[PDB]
Amino acid sequence: RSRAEYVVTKLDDLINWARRSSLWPMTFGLACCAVEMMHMAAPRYDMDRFGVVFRASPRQADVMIVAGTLTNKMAPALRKVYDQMPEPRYVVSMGSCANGGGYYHYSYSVVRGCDRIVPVDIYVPGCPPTAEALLYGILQLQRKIKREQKLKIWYRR
Amino acid sequence: TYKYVNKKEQESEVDMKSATDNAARILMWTELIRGLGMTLSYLFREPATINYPFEKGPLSPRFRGEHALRRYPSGEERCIACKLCEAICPAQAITIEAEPRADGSRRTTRYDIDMTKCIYCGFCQEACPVDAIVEGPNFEFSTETHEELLYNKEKLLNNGDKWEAEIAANIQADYLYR
Amino acid sequence: ELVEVLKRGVQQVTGHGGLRGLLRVFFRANDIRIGTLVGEDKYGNKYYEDNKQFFGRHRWVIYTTEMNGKNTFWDVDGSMVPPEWHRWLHCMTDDP
Amino acid sequence: MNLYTVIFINILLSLTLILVAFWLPQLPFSMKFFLVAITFLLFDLEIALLLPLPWAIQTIKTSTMMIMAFILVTILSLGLAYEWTQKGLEW
Amino acid sequence: SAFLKNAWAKEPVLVVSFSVWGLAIIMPMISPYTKYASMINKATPYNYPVPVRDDGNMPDVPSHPQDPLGPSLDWLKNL
Amino acid sequence: MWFEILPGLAIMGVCLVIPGVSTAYIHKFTNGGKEKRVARVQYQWYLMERDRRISGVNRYYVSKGLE
Amino acid sequence: TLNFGHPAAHGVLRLVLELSGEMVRKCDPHIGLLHRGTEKLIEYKTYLQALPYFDRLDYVSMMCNEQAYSIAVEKLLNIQPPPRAQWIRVLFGEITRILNHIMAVTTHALDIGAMTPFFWMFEEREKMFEFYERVSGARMHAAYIRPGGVHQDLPLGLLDDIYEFSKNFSLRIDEVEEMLTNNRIWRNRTVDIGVVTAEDALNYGFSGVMLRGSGIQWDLRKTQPYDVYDQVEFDVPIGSRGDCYDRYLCRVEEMRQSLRIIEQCLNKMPPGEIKVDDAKVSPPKRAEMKTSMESLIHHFKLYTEGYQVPPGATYTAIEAPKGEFGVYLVSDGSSRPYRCKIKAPGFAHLAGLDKMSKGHMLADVVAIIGTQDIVFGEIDR
Amino acid sequence: MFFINILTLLVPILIAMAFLTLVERKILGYMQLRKGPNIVGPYGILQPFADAMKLFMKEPMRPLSMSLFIIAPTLSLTLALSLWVPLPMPHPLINLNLGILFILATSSLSVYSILWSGWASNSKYSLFGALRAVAQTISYEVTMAIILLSVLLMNGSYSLQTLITTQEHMWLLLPAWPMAMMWFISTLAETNRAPFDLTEGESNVEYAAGPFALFFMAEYTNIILMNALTTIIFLGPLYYINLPELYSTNFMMEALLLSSTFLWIRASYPRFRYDQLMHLLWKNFLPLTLALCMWHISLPIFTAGVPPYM
Amino acid sequence: ASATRVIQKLRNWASGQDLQAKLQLRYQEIAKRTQPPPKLPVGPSHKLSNNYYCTR
Numbered sequence A: 001r002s003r004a005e006y007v008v009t010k011l012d013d014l015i016n017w018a019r020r021s022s023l024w025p026m027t028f029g030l031a032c033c034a035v036e037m038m039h040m041a042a043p044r045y046d047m048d049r050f051g052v053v054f055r056a057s058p059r060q061a062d063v064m065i066v067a068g069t070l071t072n073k074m075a076p077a078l079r080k081v082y083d084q085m086p087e088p089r090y091v092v093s094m095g096s097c098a099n100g101g102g103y104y105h106y107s108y109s110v111v112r113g114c115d116r117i118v119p120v121d122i123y124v125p126g127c128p129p130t131a132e133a134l135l136y137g138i139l140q141l142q143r144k145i146k147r148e149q150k151l152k153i154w155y156r157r
Numbered sequence B: 001t002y003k004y005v006n007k008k009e010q011e012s013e014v015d016m017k018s019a020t021d022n023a024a025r026i027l028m029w030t031e032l033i034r035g036l037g038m039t040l041s042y043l044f045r046e047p048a049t050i051n052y053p054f055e056k057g058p059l060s061p062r063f064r065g066e067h068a069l070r071r072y073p074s075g076e077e078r079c080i081a082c083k084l085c086e087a088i089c090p091a092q093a094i095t096i097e098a099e100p101r102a103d104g105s106r107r108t109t110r111y112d113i114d115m116t117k118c119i120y121c122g123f124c125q126e127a128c129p130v131d132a133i134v135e136g137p138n139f140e141f142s143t144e145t146h147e148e149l150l151y152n153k154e155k156l157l158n159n160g161d162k163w164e165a166e167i168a169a170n171i172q173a174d175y176l177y178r
Numbered sequence C: 001e002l003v004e005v006l007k008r009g010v011q012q013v014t015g016h017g018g019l020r021g022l023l024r025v026f027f028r029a030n031d032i033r034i035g036t037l038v039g040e041d042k043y044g045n046k047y048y049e050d051n052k053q054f055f056g057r058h059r060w061v062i063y064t065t066e067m068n069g070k071n072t073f074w075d076v077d078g079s080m081v082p083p084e085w086h087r088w089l090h091c092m093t094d095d096p
Numbered sequence D: 001m002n003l004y005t006v007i008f009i010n011i012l013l014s015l016t017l018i019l020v021a022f023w024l025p026q027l028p029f030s031m032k033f034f035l036v037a038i039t040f041l042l043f044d045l046e047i048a049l050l051l052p053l054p055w056a057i058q059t060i061k062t063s064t065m066m067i068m069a070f071i072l073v074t075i076l077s078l079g080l081a082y083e084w085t086q087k088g089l090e091w
Numbered sequence E: 001s002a003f004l005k006n007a008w009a010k011e012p013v014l015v016v017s018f019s020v021w022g023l024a025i026i027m028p029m030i031s032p033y034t035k036y037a038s039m040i041n042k043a044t045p046y047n048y049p050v051p052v053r054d055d056g057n058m059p060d061v062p063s064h065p066q067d068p069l070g071p072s073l074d075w076l077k078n079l
Numbered sequence F: 001m002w003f004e005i006l007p008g009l010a011i012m013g014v015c016l017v018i019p020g021v022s023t024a025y026i027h028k029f030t031n032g033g034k035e036k037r038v039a040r041v042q043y044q045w046y047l048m049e050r051d052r053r054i055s056g057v058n059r060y061y062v063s064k065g066l067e
Numbered sequence G: 001t002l003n004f005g006h007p008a009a010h011g012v013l014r015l016v017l018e019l020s021g022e023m024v025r026k027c028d029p030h031i032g033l034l035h036r037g038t039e040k041l042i043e044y045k046t047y048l049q050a051l052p053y054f055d056r057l058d059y060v061s062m063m064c065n066e067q068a069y070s071i072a073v074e075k076l077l078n079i080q081p082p083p084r085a086q087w088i089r090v091l092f093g094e095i096t097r098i099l100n101h102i103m104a105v106t107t108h109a110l111d112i113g114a115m116t117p118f119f120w121m122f123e124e125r126e127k128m129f130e131f132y133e134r135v136s137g138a139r140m141h142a143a144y145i146r147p148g149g150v151h152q153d154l155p156l157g158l159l160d161d162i163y164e165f166s167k168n169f170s171l172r173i174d175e176v177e178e179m180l181t182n183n184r185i186w187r188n189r190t191v192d193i194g195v196v197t198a199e200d201a202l203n204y205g206f207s208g209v210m211l212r213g214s215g216i217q218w219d220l221r222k223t224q225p226y227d228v229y230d231q232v233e234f235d236v237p238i239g240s241r242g243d244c245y246d247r248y249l250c251r252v253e254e255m256r257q258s259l260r261i262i263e264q265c266l267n268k269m270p271p272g273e274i275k276v277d278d279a280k281v282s283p284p285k286r287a288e289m290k291t292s293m294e295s296l297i298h299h300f301k302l303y304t305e306g307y308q309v310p311p312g313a314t315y316t317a318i319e320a321p322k323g324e325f326g327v328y329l330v331s332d333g334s335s336r337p338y339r340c341k342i343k344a345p346g347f348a349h350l351a352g353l354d355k356m357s358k359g360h361m362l363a364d365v366v367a368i369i370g371t372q373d374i375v376f377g378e379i380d381r
Numbered sequence H: 001m002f003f004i005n006i007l008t009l010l011v012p013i014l015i016a017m018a019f020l021t022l023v024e025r026k027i028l029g030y031m032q033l034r035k036g037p038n039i040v041g042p043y044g045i046l047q048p049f050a051d052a053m054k055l056f057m058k059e060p061m062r063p064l065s066m067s068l069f070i071i072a073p074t075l076s077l078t079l080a081l082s083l084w085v086p087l088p089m090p091h092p093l094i095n096l097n098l099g100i101l102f103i104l105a106t107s108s109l110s111v112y113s114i115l116w117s118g119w120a121s122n123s124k125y126s127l128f129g130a131l132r133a134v135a136q137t138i139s140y141e142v143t144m145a146i147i148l149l150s151v152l153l154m155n156g157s158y159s160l161q162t163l164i165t166t167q168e169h170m171w172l173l174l175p176a177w178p179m180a181m182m183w184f185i186s187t188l189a190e191t192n193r194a195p196f197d198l199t200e201g202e203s204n205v206e207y208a209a210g211p212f213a214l215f216f217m218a219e220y221t222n223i224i225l226m227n228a229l230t231t232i233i234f235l236g237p238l239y240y241i242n243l244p245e246l247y248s249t250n251f252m253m254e255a256l257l258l259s260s261t262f263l264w265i266r267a268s269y270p271r272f273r274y275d276q277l278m279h280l281l282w283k284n285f286l287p288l289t290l291a292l293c294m295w296h297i298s299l300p301i302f303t304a305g306v307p308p309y310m
Numbered sequence I: 001a002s003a004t005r006v007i008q009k010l011r012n013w014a015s016g017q018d019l020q021a022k023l024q025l026r027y028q029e030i031a032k033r034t035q036p037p038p039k040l041p042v043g044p045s046h047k048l049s050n051n052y053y054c055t056r
Ligand code: SF4
Pocket: A030, A031, A032, A033, A067, A068, A069, A094, A095, A096, A097, A098, A102, A103, A126, A127, A128, A129, B119, G056, G059, G141
């Protein structure tokens, strides 16, 4: 089709596909939710298939999965690692400990949610959020990344 | 009864044949080649992964998954606000306040499960006398915003109506056990 | 021997309709495998079972093209499966 | 020239990538590490005195060639030997 | 000797290492071909062979390359 | 099953034979069907150059007994 | 002073180290990054509603952890679980030690650099969780082992499925056995690293595979037999020298010995009830509470108020996969505890890192944490 | 036409680079009981193209002379793609009389990239990890070079083109196998692949997006190049002057299998310790190489086999 | 399973073990779902006589 609008819709569709297909995640590894993802990385529910990197340093990570309670001693760090991740970056909060305080909500040493520390994109629920459940959450991030229309907004801005 | 691991029972004195066998082990990396064979072997095994959207990892009837409030077949919600589901919740997640409905029946004006607070123990499933609050099978309820995770009576009742058919089958399968 | 595997391969490829069908499956379900339709729900999802394959992959769902309005050709999510057929897919109950 | 042509394409290809990459987006000290680097050159120099050996094979002498080459390899290896004997090479 | 044995089984590289060092230091000395290397390479003709004037006082030099006189490499042939 | 790894290897392979067949036919085209002369030592460059002078300007053209 | 800390280590360890060159001369591990207040929260929660907390202290050995609280609370109530329940706790306790050891051996390798052993065993681990999920409904964090007895009977197909897993599991240990036990590269990375002498191990309170690896013969499963560990036969895998290899080899043997214990439990599990029949301690059955008044009163009071265990205090230690896991539960007559000191095999082990990692490189420290099987949930509590 | 040839060598190699990554993510997968990436594209063929863009699109790096930072990846890709210029797949592109010295010298320069990377990191230990890498590269250079000198002396020249005529009857593996192994292990060290990989070990991480990619592209191209040098120097593909491509066809087959081997090595072995790595080269291999170096100056002379120059 | 004999033989050899006998993937050996309904046993203390709690 012929319209500067159509070219700018198709090209983000391209840019969005690249970010969607290759989401190199970074797992802090707090508490136990990290295990329920080490199961996602494992053979029953491979994540690599979907284009997910088992281990990625912050500077090369697209997604941060906060698994586990964010205590008031690890908070000052999470923010640092979130702040040092490359710009295109997304956060997935896994576990009722991270999205909200979960058991340990009322503790004096637990931040009641990572949303207080880092902006959160998808909240995956469950005490050990099941591994498919994380995989559904990562797939929901991919649906959110498809919908984003950054080039369209710059054109009509 | 104990067992020595890594304890050499005795000092086998080197015999040329033995020495050669060993020296060959160091020189021609024989054991290293052994390890490569194992991985080549699996390369030929069928991979165990499942297409996640198309195929799903099996969960049996007791899977706790996502909270739902059931209703009687007639259409009367099961909960009668005894509020011990609130009492036994370990995380303080369920908040219940009640008042006698116009019919005169006991019912909960507000039933709020904070799922981010909930640690999915499944005791609420256990505690309810009318078994109104059940651990529903669905585990896929990831939400973009934190507020969506907080659930009031209307979401849970709606969750109950959507999954009632499977919840009934699951409770049917496991009630003899309980 | 090898001919047999190639043969079953042809069966699979030629099985999912014409090339159109194969491409429909190849690109959105990412698996050219043929099973027995165990049913089609009112939403449109089609469910299949191949007991020969391992437990993990004997029951699969090929989601619909459009559910509740939304196009589901490529944007397929698990929840699309209806609550009735959810337990069959997850092996909660061995009965369709 | 033919090589020059290839190489400049090679740099161009890399500079192109980095440029797009930056444009599309729109004191510890030690003696062992130091010692090795030395060893490395002592060995690197020797590699040099050993590199002409392919041309020197065809030398009419032959006897002297090998007598020389064997002496060089042996004396350096002894250097290594003393490196082992001494704490060197023991990090 | 005994250490030699264990050395053959422990640290079995140096043993091999030295062994080769020596075997290369011996074979040249004792071999039916060592001499050929200095000849085979000597013979290989790289620079033009300039011809000498015929004072006529030399019977050794062949007056023509194919003559029955002069050096031969039949040793190189059938080597 | 492992056979799925093959598609990727194939693409690598096809992309590692191209270069060897390509360089070895863009030579036999530019040099007139005769392998590009390898002038390791000057003599060869001389002979090559001599050839150039002998005919046209290009060495690949090769005059014969009929000249 | 390099402050190592995602740190390649298990959990989150800010290991404040001092690098004398690459050789590390001192480590000052700064834990506390996962202290959740687990033991101040328990004081405000009834004995049943605090069980869940014990599944999250060591998060890789859930049921063995909840067998220490269950034994404690049971002692303070002078009640004993029914015979079938005790076998089920021993059956689930060894599935957890296989599960922890697969965790410890494979993640240690992930740290050293061997990546394939983790993937092969982790598929064998989801096979195992399924057993948790099929018996409790949670893949991990089950809450199955209850302070009195266990919560629900085994589904009617579980013991056949546990036989099929145990039947073929040993080949799977054999396979990483070949890939990571004789590789010169593993042995070099693991042998003669973090040697701990026998008396030093007792003095530092190591109490675990770390105690057994240096040759001290102590297993709380045979010495002080809790539950039924008196009616099952197994061999403690005592190592000889103490290097991180001997400790690995011991962990691989315990997985094998646990298959021997799991076999006995499937072969000899008694017909019976899964929870003690005192309604005062264990809830009444669903049918009974809906037809008998004494049962509804007992269900209402137990869920709303609690067991009200008699006043006293006890330290009960069970051999958790990591080491001795003990709960010092001090109890007033109230339904909610007064103190619950979780002894974590791990608070003692991490203290030993500075002594054990002596004259060692930056890389050795990665192996030293790996061979302590430290999960920071237990240490931080 | 020369450019056409320039394109024919670089573009295909770069594409091969990309798919090696995919192949590394499927062969490692099946070995670990997992399908690997098959969902993006068909059978994961579009997977390598997908992440590359991600990197590039990822917003600019934010480090602290902005040159020893941007020179380093450019140098890494430039040297690696450059070293494919003389490889004698059948006919080489730029035939160099001292060809193997070009490959040895160009590899050596990769070290400077590592050096500058640290001096730009401005992180003391980064410098540490950098000098901590110069030894893997330069030390595995000292045996790497001697192993080649042994080869050359049995080939007669430094030109890689001569080995096609040296290996017309038998691979140089049969003779000189003891060094092949030692060339293979050294090829594993110089490409910082697994058994010898501290580059990402003890966490490169300093570079994200476009810089990450260039080095990365470089590594993988090297992974191929060094394997290809093994497939010319030691495994000599059959050469028929009448049809050159069977040389390249077998070069294709042997290179892919030996490239497959370092993929297989990675999954199969734990990583060696820093000193355990240097302990191997200076203690285990260098004495073997120096002695076998002398045996290769003696084998020619007393067997009267001095190789023909040219 | 479902592997051509040759692949199996290569598998068994390279591994050094009859991996076919003990495959990790599960096929129709796992307990069927919907196992029969369970009538669990009632334990002691359910006697209707001589069951005084004071004595238990
Ligand atoms: S959420 Fe449940 S599981 Fe995840 S960390 Fe908090 S407690 Fe452990």
